[PDB]
Amino acid sequence: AKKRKKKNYSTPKKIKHKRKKVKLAVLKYYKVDENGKIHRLRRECPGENCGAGVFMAAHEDRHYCGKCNLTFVFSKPEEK
Amino acid sequence: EDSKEWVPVTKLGRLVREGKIKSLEEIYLYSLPIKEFEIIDFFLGSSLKDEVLKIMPVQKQTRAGQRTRFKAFVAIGDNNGHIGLGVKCSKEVATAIRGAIILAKLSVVPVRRGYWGNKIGKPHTVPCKVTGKCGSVSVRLIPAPRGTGIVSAPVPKKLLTMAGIEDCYTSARGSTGTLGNFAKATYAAIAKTYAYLTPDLWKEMPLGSTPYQAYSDFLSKPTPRLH
RNA sequence: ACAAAUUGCGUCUAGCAAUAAUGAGAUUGAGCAAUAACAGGUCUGUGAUGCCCUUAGAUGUCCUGGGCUGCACGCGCGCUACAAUGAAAGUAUCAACGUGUAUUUCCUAGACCGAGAGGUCCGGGUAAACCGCUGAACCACUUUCAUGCUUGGGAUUGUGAACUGAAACUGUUCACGAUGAACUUGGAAUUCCCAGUAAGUGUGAGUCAUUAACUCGCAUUGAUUACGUCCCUGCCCUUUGUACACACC
RNA sequence: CUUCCGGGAAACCAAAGCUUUUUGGGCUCCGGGGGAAGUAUGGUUGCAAAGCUGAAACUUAAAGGAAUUGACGGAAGGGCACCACCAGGAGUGGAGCCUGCGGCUUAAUUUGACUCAACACGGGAAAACUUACCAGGUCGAACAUAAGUGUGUAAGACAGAUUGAUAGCUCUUUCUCGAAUCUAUGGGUGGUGGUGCAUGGCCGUUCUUAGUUCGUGGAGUGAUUUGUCUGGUUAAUUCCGAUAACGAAC
């Protein structure tokens, strides 16, 4: 609460949220098949630049890895 | 620590540093010019207390705009029979009172204390009645018997508690708020007590040694003899 | 001028004289500045600061804008004028103070291209050494003009061409061919200054992505007039007056 | 006139002295803070004007005396300088234009500064930046406490909304390095926010000046003077020289 002289209380209501957290639970969702095969929910990164520990996203027809949310876009883009 | 032994400047203070006079009233005996306070630091100084009475500021109107200088009073008195009065203006209050206590020491004069009505036991008050006027205040000192202390205003009671006058009656006319004229009025009344020919002082003296005669050799020598 | 410099001696001392010199009739301007002060100015120069105020919702802060430039008007510093001593064309051909790029785009030589604006290509230079012998301007010399708001004067508005940069719009500035207004020496009032001075006349530097139209310095051309006095606004503790405090507002 | 070697608050006074220290030659008239007020009213005198007598209610803290220091501020006498003239010279004030300040207006036209000593000033030649102002935005910053526990407390982009730009600043849906436990709470932090009339600093003018001071004396009760001047001369408180300390000091 400042003090001024001429123009007070424009007030754009200052609504800035921190994080809604209405989605995106940490992956307790998982399943293993007994003796001994494992199923990897959010199957990992095929990008060889990382160790495939990202739990790549399930989305619409564009998915991405976890070390970089914008990049590694699942389209797929072909290089030739 | 002295730390500086005083230089004999005049011929009088030459002799007290050389010890040829050992009695303070000898210069009072011939009414000498006592113009070094370093004289009376020899004879007295033991039992010589300074009291100030006022540090009355005073001002002058320069063109921008005022200027204050300080007429500090101080009053020294050996507690039996010598009194002084000091007044000087300077730019600091310290450099008044460090130098006012000089100017009181130079004018230290002897008091005559006389018996009031019955000569028994170390006379106390005043031999006669004395008025000292310094500008429209005039304090009129009067004897009193033993045991009635100094009745006055609180200021010249301090002029008499340090003078050795024990039991005195006073009465002061005029503008008794002007402290300069109320200290000096009593100072010119206390010092008077040895200037009034009471009939006790008729048989005279052998009338002189005049110590520039008595010690004409040490002032004839130019060699500054020590000690 | 490093002054016994002689000069009918001023209160024996500070009698101008210009006379003596022949680099020198001060080579001669600056800086420097006491005591006491002002409610001068600066909290917006500062991590100088009391206190006051504010702080996730900033007055702080970074961004995109805007503005600080806007206008019937008033006022000051200052620019080119109002022209024949001039405006043009030509020719001749004199400076000085300075400044110039290695953690920032400087000084620019040279060629070259372009009405220009500029642009290209290749150097110099950390500078008595290169820009640079910076070969500055006004002025000098023949002509065109024929005083006619003219060819004096360039505000004014279109247009394109440009530069610098992310970005140009009461505009960043700059080029051309148009556009030629006020303005003809300026009322009462009023500023500045005594020798290389006044004024005319350029240039450098300062700020500066580009922007002087201002401020500091520099040189050039070079006068008139006083060499006095206290009417004028003046100012300095001499005397005297007062009924004046915060002092004749 | 000279002086007290008398008095006085002093200016002064041969009386304004001998009014001494609680003083005494007789005698009379008069004063008691300032106003109100020589008014009001009564008596009395005058042709009248007026004269003599003469209050108070009320108001008020000063009013007054003498002297010092402030105006080489409208008074003499001096002595300077072109921010003084004079003898001029060039100027602006006229004209257009650049600015500066106002006023106007505007969302704001940020502001400090207003005689010399505010005004092409604040080095204040600003498209943004500056920037302080105006609109939109935007960022966050400390700790002990504390409550999720590490079943994600966070933090980031796509994507369509919001945009001025992708500000995942916010978000429809997505994965994610997760811990500084991202706290309401200490409260420090910044500030071109306020007061230069709370200050430091510097700077400005007072003042182009020639002017100040100190110890030691005599001058005065004292404020304060003297030194720091009569004259001559100087750019000069610079010097002779009267030389009332100087050897002084700026």
From Swiss-Prot, chain A:
Subcellular location: Nucleus, Nucleolus
Quaternary organization: Part of the 40S ribosomal subunit. Part of the small subunit (SSU) processome, composed of more than 70 proteins and the RNA chaperone small nucleolar RNA (snoRNA) U3.
Protein name from the UniProt record: Small ribosomal subunit protein eS31
Known role: Component of the 40S subunit of the ribosome. Part of the small subunit (SSU) processome, first precursor of the small eukaryotic ribosomal subunit. During the assembly of the SSU processome in the nucleolus, many ribosome biogenesis factors, an RNA chaperone and ribosomal proteins associate with the nascent pre-rRNA and work in concert to generate RNA folding, modifications, rearrangements and cleavage as well as targeted degradation of pre-ribosomal RNA by the RNA exosome.
Organism of provenance: Drosophila melanogaster
Span of the signal peptide: none
Top-level division of the source organism's lineage: Eukaryota
Chain intervals annotated as zinc finger (C4-type): 45-68
Gene assigned in the entry: RpS27A
UniProtKB/Swiss-Prot annotation, chain B:
Domain S5 DRBM: 48-111
Biological role stated in the UniProt entry: Component of the ribosome, a large ribonucleoprotein complex responsible for the synthesis of proteins in the cell. The small ribosomal subunit (SSU) binds messenger RNAs (mRNAs) and translates the encoded message by selecting cognate aminoacyl-transfer RNA (tRNA) molecules. The large subunit (LSU) contains the ribosomal catalytic site termed the peptidyl transferase center (PTC), which catalyzes the formation of peptide bonds, thereby polymerizing the amino acids delivered by tRNAs into a polypeptide chain.
Protein family according to the UniProt entry: Belongs to the universal ribosomal protein uS5 family.
Assigned keywords, A-Z: Developmental protein, Differentiation, Oogenesis, Phosphoprotein, Ribonucleoprotein, Ribosomal protein
InterPro entries, sorted: Ribosomal_Su5_D2-typ_SF, Ribosomal_uS5, Ribosomal_uS5_C, Ribosomal_uS5_euk/arc, Ribosomal_uS5_N, Ribosomal_uS5_N_CS, Ribsml_uS5_D2-typ_fold_subgr
List of residues that carry Phosphoserine: 23
Protein name as catalogued: Small ribosomal subunit protein uS5
Gene Ontology cellular component list: cytoplasm; cytosolic ribosome; cytosolic small ribosomal subunit; nucleolus
Statement: the UniProt record of this protein carries the keyword Glycoprotein: no
Molecular function via GO: RNA binding; structural constituent of ribosome
Keyword set includes Ligase: no
NCBIfam families tied to this protein: uS5_euk_arch (TIGR01020)
GO biological process: cytoplasmic translation; oogenesis; translation
Gene3D superfamilies: 3.30.160.20, 3.30.230.10
Superkingdom per UniProt: Eukaryota
One protein family per Pfam: Ribosomal_S5_C
